[PDB]
Structures are given as structure tokens and as C-alpha cells.
Design a protein around this ligand. Sequence first.
Ligand SMILES: [Zn+2]
Ligand SMILES: [Zn+2]
Ligand SMILES: [Zn+2]
Ligand SMILES: [Zn+2]
Lengths: 697, 697
Amino acid sequence: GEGMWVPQQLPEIAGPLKKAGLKLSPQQISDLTGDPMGAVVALGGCTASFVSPNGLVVTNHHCAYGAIQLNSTAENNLIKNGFNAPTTADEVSAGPNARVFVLDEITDVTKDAKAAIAAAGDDALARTKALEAFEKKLIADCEAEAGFRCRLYSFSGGNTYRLFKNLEIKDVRLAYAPPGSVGKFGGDIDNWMWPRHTGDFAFYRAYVGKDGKPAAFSKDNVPYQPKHWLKFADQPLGAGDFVMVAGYPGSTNRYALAAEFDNTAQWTYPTIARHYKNQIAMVEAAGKQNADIQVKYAATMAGWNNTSKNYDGQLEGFKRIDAAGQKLREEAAVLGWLKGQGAKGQPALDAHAKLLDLLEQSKATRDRDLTLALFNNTAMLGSATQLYRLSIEREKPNAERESGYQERDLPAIEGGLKQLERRYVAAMDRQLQEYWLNEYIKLPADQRVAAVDAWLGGNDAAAVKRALDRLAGTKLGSTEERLKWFAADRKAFEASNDPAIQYAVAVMPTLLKLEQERKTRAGENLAARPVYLQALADYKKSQGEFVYPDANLSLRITFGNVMGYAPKDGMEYTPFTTLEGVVAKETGQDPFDSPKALLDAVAAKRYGGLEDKRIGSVPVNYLSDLDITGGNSGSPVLDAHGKLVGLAFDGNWESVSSNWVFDPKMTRMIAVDGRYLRWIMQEVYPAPQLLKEMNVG
Amino acid sequence: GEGMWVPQQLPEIAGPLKKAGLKLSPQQISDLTGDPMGAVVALGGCTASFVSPNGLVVTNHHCAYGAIQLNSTAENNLIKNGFNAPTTADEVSAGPNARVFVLDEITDVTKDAKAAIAAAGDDALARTKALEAFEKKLIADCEAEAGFRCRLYSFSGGNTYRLFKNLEIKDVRLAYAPPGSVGKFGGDIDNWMWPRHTGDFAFYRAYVGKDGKPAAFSKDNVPYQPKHWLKFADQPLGAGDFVMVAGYPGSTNRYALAAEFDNTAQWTYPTIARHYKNQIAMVEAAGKQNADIQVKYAATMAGWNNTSKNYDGQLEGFKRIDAAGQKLREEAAVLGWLKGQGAKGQPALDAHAKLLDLLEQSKATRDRDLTLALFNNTAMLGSATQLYRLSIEREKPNAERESGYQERDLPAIEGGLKQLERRYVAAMDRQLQEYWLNEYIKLPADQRVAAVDAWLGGNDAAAVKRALDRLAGTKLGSTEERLKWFAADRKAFEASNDPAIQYAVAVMPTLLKLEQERKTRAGENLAARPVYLQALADYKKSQGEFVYPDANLSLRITFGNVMGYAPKDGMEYTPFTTLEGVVAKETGQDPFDSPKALLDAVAAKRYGGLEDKRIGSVPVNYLSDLDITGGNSGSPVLDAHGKLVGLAFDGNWESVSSNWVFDPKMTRMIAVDGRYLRWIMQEVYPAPQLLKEMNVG
Ligand SMILES: [Zn+2]
Ligand SMILES: [Zn+2]
Ligand SMILES: [Zn+2]
Ligand SMILES: [Zn+2]
């Protein structure tokens, strides 16, 4: 059922957990470095878990797609073929930026954090800088232990702060991916849909130095030995059974002003979707010509497809449940409520007023802000602005450098410049720069950027064309030139005749000023958000409704039971799909082109000891009423005894609007059954070595 | 489950009926003139049943559609608005050709029929004429009692013959029809489909003379007093519960040569579907501009839509089950098995070869034969040919007149010529004449008809237009002119300058020659069909398959249980639909434009005392695994205690290929729940008088 519960809410959900079927004690789940919860790890925008005492980590194929794509060429396509390492020496690096984070400690630091914030008094910008300075000092102290990375999380609008501390494993290697026709069966046609038939799984292995401490990739590193790992279930999962997920959902917007919603529905989601589709169309074409462009842009392409379909689905789900309607009506009812109680509820009513005007403000410039952001996110302009900004920050003491530009951020910066080699083709990026310039010129005169106007030389196909021809002369296209500039000083940037770098030097003043304009808006928000959101929460508690914070990339628990749903009268989706359903979709064309070994094994009812009698086949995917969102991919699904029953990977089409307005009747998690993992690894693309290491063959 | 069982098979289904849940004794079902079976009546192409002692008859809306349409005008459109007679004097005539047939007696005449055929000797045309004379004499004797109509049925390819005697009620009046947006909710979009939300019911009343005997319409007639009628269930029908249907299915082709299937799938269904769709397009387009065409062609257009969509569904179903492959392998098995039996199999083998050759003779002229038939079925050429044929037959003694043109057929002929007034617009029929002329001209040289070629006197768009201008001069467009010709003698036809009459006179020799050919082939079939189909039956029995005859418009029993079906992996259709499903489909545009009182009542949760707590609403339609087809529409669905729980009206999309190859997993009946009949008549389009008369008031 509903809720992305923080581990500190476990007493609130103890009884609900038992009633839904948990047969572990709430005590045992509370131990976030215990069995099983100490097996659950964060990847950075996906979840995973350890499944052997030798560092084996399972997550989704689409979570590992980055890594598989980084290791793929046109002439050896791991995406298409799969990857299997018969020994640990065979495992290939997942990339310099790949991580496994292993939870170490959580601490409330709320009291201190709002003290620091208050200590700056009445100046919006100073309030932001004081929180920034508080966070940096905290993190600096927490990361003083070698091998740990820490993070500060603000919950419920800034009513609570916690500090998380993680072991940072920095050598992650690919051990197994099934072929892409299993890992992503049904492609973007089945994405966000049920019935689903997707084998969305892949395995990493986690490595440290010989001293047992984190290290970056080296051939002398050896497998991490986790304190805790998951065991596969020995009881078959069936309809109605208890399941639970722990993981790292990224963001929700369930506490929001109606105007935040209207803006998102009417503007943000339609605009982003349109832009995303336009770039897909461009890249799709060029890649039909050019297998190098196709393999190199595959990850970016999957991203654009996934987000644009999600927003299409959110827009549809709003209309289905009248979300505009509900938001209006709960806002009226909460505003009603507040004046309602006169003296006491006046702080909250003021907050509402502030927040709302802050939001008209961000609204005045939103087209400018998006367009410039995405224009600067193309490859060579991104690289030049990031690298120039780093040269600016390096002049300050580390403690004062912008987050993202401190010493602690250097590994990831340098890592990104090397990963970009596998994701960049100049003829392709030129077309994207063109696309974004065209949209820039499009902007109204009041919505323009001085420095960009001037850099460009006026508003037409001709100038666009000059820009593109000039930028084409950058040397930032090679990894070596990027890594040269990664180490160069600010003066060398200001001296450069590289046209990409000249663009950066030209606009950076504007970008820093707009960053100040954002830090100022956030500071005002920081006063007004926690009060108002605390009232939203208070009203909900007064309606007996469930109260938990919007997702914020921290660890959450969700629980429920295996069940389907009913999209329309006269029909129901069943909780499971089956092997026969995979083969019924077969067309021999992508994305419905399963391996021959699967097709033959299914036509033979070779079920490998994995059949579930109740469904008369091996289960493939399943639905449950858990409450998950982007960031939960790869999360282990555990049964009543804490055993592994599947991996979370998607939501059904009608679920995605629950980011804004939760609908219990149509919100389901889609998970890959652990018996399908097993079956694929026995009969289709075998990994007898991983099965044995997981004590299942 | 499977089976359109003849009443004489009750001994064989007694056990299975009881296992499925029947609580009436089987001998109580054996009494075909008793309770409740004596309540079930034939309408001639639909089924109905009595539901009051005062002659009230319930059937489907689509069955009464002809009669509602005949009482409809552009200005006062009962299809649109519904009809409700607050007292029995307000009932309107359903039309001169409307009938209710009440089973009186069934006689086996197999032995006498087969002796009549054998007496004819070797000659195929004499064999047909001998069976015709046999039938006519039998029927004349059986119809010696005033007010009775009799019918001879051939079963299992001519292995059994039975005669049915029915009381023939000839004054049928419309008593109630819901608005068309209930009676045909979802229109052709939801036709042949589940989920289904259609209140497909209407009521007639049956009338006789004051002396108790059948009579054509008169104000002096009074309601018929049936010996038996149905009662509404007092127990709520639920999933899994026993249901049975008795009715009059028209035809199936489950005993067929593989070549008969091949020709149907490859030529018959595509060809007819195309032709019906071409004509639908013309009539639709014209009716958009002319509300008189729209109302006058509505019943015609409902037939073309229903059949062409049925045919599309069969072709898709044949692919889903590989019906071609299944027919091929069964016939290879049966022929194997026959060869198997040396000498004693040889007559079935020779019968097979003959039936295959006769299929080839048919095929050689199939284009000509279909095209000429459907050309001559437009309104004026149909009337001219029918009436001219009648004038020829009238010069023979009655016993020798072609079936359809005997004295006993005169009331139906005359009634057709009157009904046509409400179904004909010259400017529409002209366009249909034009369509069939352009199809005729596409035929190749060996498929043309000399008499039509001469009449046409050219082969181009110009000749087509001159022919249409000539035909538009007919005076048969008026009812009075048609009835003049109904009485006129042959020389009067041959003297006429009416251009439609002249066409009829010109082509009649050719139609008579073609009829002789079909009689000759039928007479060859008479010899071969019973031997091969007996072999087919014996083969099925040796495989332990169900053995029951193909439908042939006679009374059948089917039974089973309420249950949905699974159309694909990950999905199930539930056995019921509900009121909230009707409203979920509402668009305010035909065909999804429910009466406002329905939309209000559902919004207000006015369930009228009819809610089934197990589904949380009033049920609308339901699925069951009964075995029905065309002609079963309007059949009552009875529960375990023989009480009325709904009406049969349709089958699901995947079912329709069961006409050729029975598929148990996806063959379901769609029925309208009796509770939805009641609910409409309470909350939406009220008829308290009829509810009272059925004591559910
Ligand atoms: Zn247990
Ligand atoms: Zn250089
Ligand atoms: Zn006349
Ligand atoms: Zn009972």
C-alpha cells in the first residue's frame, strides 16, 4: 500500500507490516546494517543488493546499461549479445564513475542545521550560503575517515535533516548481463506497461584494495567481502503473498501547491517531452545510417525515451483522475482549514503566500532557464563550461568552492570526461547544438541572454550556421584535450582560441549571476517551505491519511502484497506473467526478438525445476501494491522471511501520476521474478558459476 | 461447454447437466411443452420467451430492431427514443411478417424421408424433386389444422429428419423497447466484443382472435394466454453458477470438408465482407445528408455491419488457432482411418471424392453466382424478379409450386412488399444498383451472363449510367404498385413497359436455369453427404469427442457456467460488467451516449434493490461457456432452478471462429443480466406496468 517510509518510521509501520504478512520482527528490519537490510546498496540513481559473500551485486539491466554500453562497440555489441564472465578475472570495469554505496550510519542533525540557517537572519542569499557552509563542514568531518562518502538530506520541506554515511566502493565490474532482447524485451513499446515480459537484471562485482579499503580500478584489487548478503527464496511466491522493498527513490511531489502542479502539467512535462522526442527523432535517423552513432548514443536515447514516455503517462493519469481538480480541492480545504484556527495557523498561511509568489518568479524565466540549461548540456559546451568553472573554483579555498567543484568531486569530473568518449560523435552533437540554437532564437526578446545574443551575432539561420561552423573547430572532442583542460588554470582558459572554451568564458558571468539568482530564491523558499509543508502534514494527520516524506534519494521501505489491478470494468490484469507470454509476443524483429535458446526452451516446457504449479509455468514478471519510484530500479524484493523474490524495475502505465496524486487502485510495482533470473541463467544464457556462488545450482 | 444438443440427446447430457449444477430433474427439461421449456419460442431467425400469462414476450433489442425501425420516422424515431406502451391498447404492430412460433410437436420422419429419396433412383435432379414432394406433402398434412406452421429439418447431413409443428402467432405487437443507446450501447464498435455494456432487450405481446386462434393484426384480437411462461430469478447470479440456454441456432459448419473451409476463409468471407463494407460506406455517407435515408436503411445497415464484422473476426480467429492446419490434419486422420477399414470404409471415401468434386463445380461460377444474386437483391430488381417468379409459379398446381411461392408463402410475400416502404429510397437504391453493376462488369468473360450483358448493351461507365436512368423509370417504388403486381398474371408482366419488370422478364430464364443447376448439385449432395458425415461422426466418437449435429434452425440446448476467459498472458476478462462501466465509456456521441437518466442514476448510486454485493454494483452483462450462434439471440438464460437470469445476445471476438473449429478456452456467450433489464425499467426508461405484470414490480 501507500508509503515510502523512512527507517525511523518502523514503529508506526510495525503492526501494518505484521498484518500484511512480515514474519521477521520489526527489530530485525530496523537494523539498517543487519540481515537483510545491510545487503541493500545504492548505485547513485538505482538500487542494488549483495547476493554472495564474494561481492556479487544484482541490479537491473537498465541500471547496468550505462556500463554495458561503455563496454560495447558496433563490432562487439554487449547490449545486443549479453556478457558473461566465466571467472572473476574476466569481469570488465563498469566505468570510472560506477559506484556501490554501503550504508554505515544515519544521524539526525536537524537541530544544528536549522540553527546555522537561523544564524544568518533575514537575508535570503545568506541563508542558502550558511546551510551550504554547514553541510560542507559536516561532510568534511564525516569523510575524514578514508573510504567513506557522506550526504546531507533534507526531509519534509526542511523540517528534518539527516546525515548519511556510506562506504564508497569505487571499483565496480560487470559480471553478467543477459542479452538485450531479454534485458529489455519489448523495448520502449512495453516500457511503462503491463503485461510485461522483461528479464530486467544484471550482475556487478564490488572490489576494494588488498588493505580492504576502497580504491579506483586496478588489477591488484580484489572482491569486497560484504557483512551481509541476500539469499534466494526457497518458498515459491504466489498471489497475495507479502513483499517488501528497500531502496533509494529519487523524488516525489505529493506535498505541493496546486500551482506547482499546474505548472508541471501545463508547461514542464509537455515542453520537456516535446524536446526529448525531437532529439530522439534526430538521433534515431543518424543512427540508422551509422552504427557508431547508434551504439554511442544508445544510453542517452534510452533516457530520453524513458522520461518522455513517463511524462506522457503522467499527463494521461492526471486527466484520468482529475488531478488538477483534486489539487485545487485539497488546497481550498487546507486553506479553509488554516484560518479555521486563527492565531495558531497564521505562520502557515503566510508561507503559502510566499511560496506561491516564489513560484511566479521562477515562472517568469522558465523558458529561458530550460533552454539555456539544455543548450549548455550538449557535449562540448557542457565540457567547456564545467571545465572553465572548475578552474575558477580551484582559485578559492576548498571549503568555499561550489559543491560539485571541490576536491571530493574531482574523481567524478575526470571520470565523466573519459566516459564521454563512448557517448560523443561530433556530427551528431552538431545537430543537437543546431536544435538548441534554433530553440534559443525562437525565444522572446525579454527572455534572452545578453552574452549569448552577442556570442551569436543575431537571430537567423545565417548566425546559427556561423556558430555551428565555429564550434566545429574545438579540440574538446578528444578525451586527451578534455583531460588537459581538467588540469589547466583559469588564465590558460581565458587565453584559449578553442571556440567551445571561448563560449564558456563569454557566458560564465551570466551563469554565475543566474546561479546567484537561484541561490537567493532557494533561501526564501528555505524559510517558508518547512512551515507550510508541516501544516500539509498536520492536516493529513487530522484526516487519518498516511504521513511520510516525499522521496529525496534516501533509503526507504515499502511493503504490501502481490496483486494485480483492474484498469477498466470487465477486466483485470493478473499478478503474474509467464514464459508462454514471452513467446506469444515474438516477432523476430526488435524489440520482440527473444534468443533462440529461450524460444526452444519454452516450446519444450523446459521449466528447469522453477515452475510454479499455481500458474502452470515459470513466472516472468509480477505486480504488487508497493510504492516505488525512479531510483528504486534494481531494489531487491523480499518475501515475508526476508528472502529475495525479484527485483523492482518499473511501474504500470496508470501508476506514474502517483508522483503528484497517489491512486491506490492503479499504483503497482512491476518486478522481475527471481525464478526468471534463475531460469534465464540456467536455460538461455547460462551462468552456472554465478548460480553456484548464489547456492542455487 | 461445447454442444448444441438436440432435445433427443437429453439422456446423454443428463449427467453433465447435474454436474454443472442443474437442480431441475432432467425429465422436467424433457417436456418441451412444459415448464419451463414450453415458454421458449422461435421468432424466425431469433429466439424469445413468454414472461407472463398475458402473452408478454421478451427478446433482444437487435431482434426487435426490424419492428422498432418499421414503426420509426425521421421525425419520430423509436430507435433513438425507445418505446413504451402504458396499456396493451397502446402497443403498435411489429409488422405483417412478425411471428411467434410456439412448439406443439416434434416427429421423427427419417425412415419415410429416406425411402422417398431412395425411390427416385440414380438421377440427381429427380432425387431433389422427390425430397421436395415428400416435404411438401408432409407439411400440407401437418398444416391441415388451422393456425399451425410446420417445418422439416434435416440433421447430420441427411442422416436424420424431423418435423416440427408450431402454433403460428401472426399478430405480434411492440410493447417496450429501451432507447437505442441502451439497446445498442457501444454500437458497431462494441459489437462482437467484451467488455460489453449493452442492454439488449425488448418486449413484444402475442395476440390471437377472440376465438383463441391465430389471426393477422386486428383491433378485435386479444392477448394470447400461454400455457407456460418464465419467472425472474429470486437468487442472485454469480460467478461459477450454472446456466443453460434453449433456443434456435441457425447454422454451424463444424462438419465440413477441409476444402469447404478453405474456400470460405480464402474467398467467401473476404469477398462478402468487402462488398458489405463498400455498401456500408455509401449508405452511411448518404444518410449523413438525409435523415430519411438514415432511418429507412438502419436495419439493413445493422445487418451489413454485423456480418462483415463477424467475418473479419472469423478470419482473425482462424489465424489464432490455425484452423486451416487443423482442418487439414483432421481430414488426413479421418481419411487414414477410413482406408484403415478396407472394404467397409470405401463408401465414405467415395462420398468424400464426390463432395469435393461438387465443391469444385460450385467454385467455378462463384463470382457470377454471388454477384448476380446480390445485384438482384437490390430493392426494385428484387421486387421485380420475385413478383415475376410468383406469376409463373401461380400457373402450376399448388403442390408443384416452388417452395417460397406456394399458397402458404403468400402472406410473407405480401408483407415483404409492404415492409419495404419503410426500407427503400430511390436515390439510395440507385447507388447500390450502380455498385453492383460496376462489380458485374469486372467479371471475366466466362463468368458473365448473356442476358445481363445484352440488357446492359455496353461495358463502361456510360452504359452503366444509361441502365440506371432506364431503371429509375420503374413505378415499383410505391407499395400500391408492388401489390398490383403481386396479383397480376404472367402475361401482364410480359406485356409491361416497366423497366424493372422488363429486366426481370429478360433474366428470368437464366435464373431458372441456374436454379436447376443448384437443384442438381443438391441432389448429388443428398447421396454423398449422409455417408461422409456419418463417417465424420463415427470418427469423432472413436476419439471420445462430443457428437452433436450442426445447427439447422431447430431447437437446441446448451449449458455450462458463468465464467470469463483469458485473452492473453497477464490479463483476464471478469465474468461481469457493472453500471459504472457503462458510464466510464460515456462520450456524449453515438454510440457511447447513454440516456441522461442512466448517467444520473449511476452517479447517485441508485441501484434499485438490484445490487449484487459481490460485485458492488448492478450487473450489466456477463460471460459464460455456453455454445451459441446466430439465431440464439434473444434466448432466455436459465439458472439451476429454471428461472430467468438474462438473455443471450452476442459472442466475444475470439469466439466467432467456433462456427468452423470449436475453441473451448475462448468461446463464450455474452448475455444481458435480468437485473439490468429490471434496472433499466426502474430507473432509466420506466415501465412499471410490465414489471408488475412480471411480478417484480
Ligand atoms: Zn514462515
Ligand atoms: Zn592540446
Ligand atoms: Zn399502376
Ligand atoms: Zn437451490
